Enzyme design. Structure first.
Site, PDB file in Angstrom:
ATOM      1  N   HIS A 197      -7.351   8.269 -11.252  1.00  0.00           N
ATOM      2  CA  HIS A 197      -5.983   7.756 -11.328  1.00  0.00           C
ATOM      3  C   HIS A 197      -6.001   6.473 -12.344  1.00  0.00           C
ATOM      4  CE1 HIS A 197      -7.583   5.112  -7.755  1.00  0.00           C
ATOM      5  NE2 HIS A 197      -8.227   6.296  -7.725  1.00  0.00           N
ATOM      6  N   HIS A 225      -9.256  -2.895 -13.300  1.00  0.00           N
ATOM      7  CA  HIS A 225      -8.675  -1.776 -13.760  1.00  0.00           C
ATOM      8  C   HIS A 225      -7.275  -2.016 -14.602  1.00  0.00           C
ATOM      9  CE1 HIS A 225      -7.313  -1.861  -9.556  1.00  0.00           C
ATOM     10  NE2 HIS A 225      -6.193  -1.528 -10.312  1.00  0.00           N
ATOM     11  N   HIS A 279      -2.977  -0.425 -15.153  1.00  0.00           N
ATOM     12  CA  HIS A 279      -2.086   0.549 -15.088  1.00  0.00           C
ATOM     13  C   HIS A 279      -1.263   0.492 -16.420  1.00  0.00           C
ATOM     14  CE1 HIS A 279      -2.794   0.598 -10.716  1.00  0.00           C
ATOM     15  NE2 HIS A 279      -2.914  -0.603 -10.999  1.00  0.00           N
ATOM     16  N   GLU A 337       3.205  -2.839 -13.273  1.00  0.00           N
ATOM     17  CA  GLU A 337       3.673  -2.574 -11.735  1.00  0.00           C
ATOM     18  C   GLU A 337       4.383  -3.706 -11.396  1.00  0.00           C
ATOM     19  OE1 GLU A 337      -0.007  -1.571  -9.398  1.00  0.00           O
ATOM     20  OE2 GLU A 337       0.808   0.512  -9.685  1.00  0.00           O
ATOM     21  N   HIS A 362      -5.440  -5.644 -13.368  1.00  0.00           N
ATOM     22  CA  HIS A 362      -5.925  -5.968 -11.803  1.00  0.00           C
ATOM     23  C   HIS A 362      -7.425  -6.361 -11.676  1.00  0.00           C
ATOM     24  CE1 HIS A 362      -2.001  -3.852 -10.214  1.00  0.00           C
ATOM     25  NE2 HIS A 362      -1.778  -5.071 -10.892  1.00  0.00           N
ATOM     26  N   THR A 410      -1.634  -0.985  -4.316  1.00  0.00           N
ATOM     27  CA  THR A 410      -0.618  -0.469  -4.854  1.00  0.00           C
ATOM     28  C   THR A 410      -1.047   1.023  -5.048  1.00  0.00           C
ATOM     29  OG1 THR A 410      -1.143  -0.919  -7.237  1.00  0.00           O
ATOM     30  CG2 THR A 410       0.154  -2.560  -6.152  1.00  0.00           C
ATOM     31  N   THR A 411      -2.326   1.269  -4.845  1.00  0.00           N
ATOM     32  CA  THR A 411      -2.628   2.975  -4.541  1.00  0.00           C
ATOM     33  C   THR A 411      -3.151   3.176  -3.232  1.00  0.00           C
ATOM     34  OG1 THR A 411      -4.912   2.469  -5.238  1.00  0.00           O
ATOM     35  CG2 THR A 411      -3.421   3.127  -7.116  1.00  0.00           C
TER      36      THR A 411
HETATM   37 ZN   LIG Z   1      -4.408  -1.967  -9.750  1.00  0.00          ZN
END
Ligand SMILES: [Zn+2]
EC number: 4.2.1.1
Length: 258
Positions: free
Chosen positions: A62, A92, A94, A104, A117, A196-197
């Site tokens: 992801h 990581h 996004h 996000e 993040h 958020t995942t």
């Molecule tokens: Zn994240």
């Protein structure tokens, strides 16, 4: 039929396997700058990353994570709205399929090209796995990326992406210094939220920096060549791996600045 970011398994579907998705302290959120409250008791953030020890970079299907040795107080975050010491375990990003989306969190509904993040866990809980079960278990530092000039400190990450193109691939990634990803100012907004995942646990104190970093077009382009799929499976570009803003509900966003 595992969770993901597609039409049939995307964020609007996660509540079926993870009910907390409809919880009271979900992330991300839109940061309304005019209703955020300046809080003078908020201390400045303390980031101590000089002894950071990166180990590996991994494509987990992801996103890609850069992992650190968290068996000692080598890279820690203290201060701000935190009580105690939080150890960096991984970072990581996004990102989007276009430069107009990818973050996000949003600021006055504005979306950035990507969001970094830096994930830390509260040493008092002993390990990351125990920390996620607590309301004060994690502290995540969120940094926005806008497209402009290049970030020299990110190039080492961009160059290794070809070696972890598909899910499950990993590569040695030693001597990476995360200080090269920080903006000049550490002014920030903070609010209580969640991962958020999935599993979407409500264990995060969010610290979102006001100042974005700039990255070049070409650097963000290389993130978009990654794949959600495993080697030998049909190719699906790793893009738009962001969750949309969730309702703020009974929460107040505080600002360290005016
Ligand atoms: Zn994240």
């Amino acid at each position: 039929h595992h969770w993901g970011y597609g039409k049939h398994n995307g964020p609007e579907h996660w509540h079926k396997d993870f009910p907390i998705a409809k919880g009271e302290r979900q992330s991300p959120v839109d940061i309304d700058t005019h209703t955020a409250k300046y809080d003078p008791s908020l201390k400045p953030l303390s980031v101590s990353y000089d002894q950071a020890t990166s180990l590996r970079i991994l494509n987990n299907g992801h996103a890609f994570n850069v992992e650190f040795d968290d068996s000692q107080d080598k890279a820690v975050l203290k201060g701000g709205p935190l009580d105690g010491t939080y150890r960096l375990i991984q970072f990581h990003f996004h990102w989007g399929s276009l430069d107009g989306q990818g973050s996000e969190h949003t600021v006055d509904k504005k979306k950035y090209a990507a969001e970094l993040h830096l994930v830390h866990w509260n040493t008092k809980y002993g390990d990351f796995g125990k920390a996620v079960q607590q309301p004060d278990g994690l502290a995540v530092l969120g940094i926005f990326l806008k497209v402009g000039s290049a970030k020299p400190g990110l190039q080492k990450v961009v160059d290794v992406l070809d070696s972890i193109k598909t899910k499950g691939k990993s590569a040695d990634f030693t001597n990476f210094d995360p200080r090269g990803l920080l903006p000049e100012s550490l002014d920030y907004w903070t609010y209580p939220g969640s991962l958020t995942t999935p599993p979407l646990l409500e264990c995060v104190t969010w610290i979102v920096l006001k100042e974005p970093i700039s990255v070049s077009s070409e650097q963000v382009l290389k993130f978009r060549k990654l794949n959600f799929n495993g080697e030998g499976e049909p190719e699906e570009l790793m893009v738009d791996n962001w969750r949309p803003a969730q309702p703020l509900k009974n929460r107040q966003i505080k600002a360290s600045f005016k």
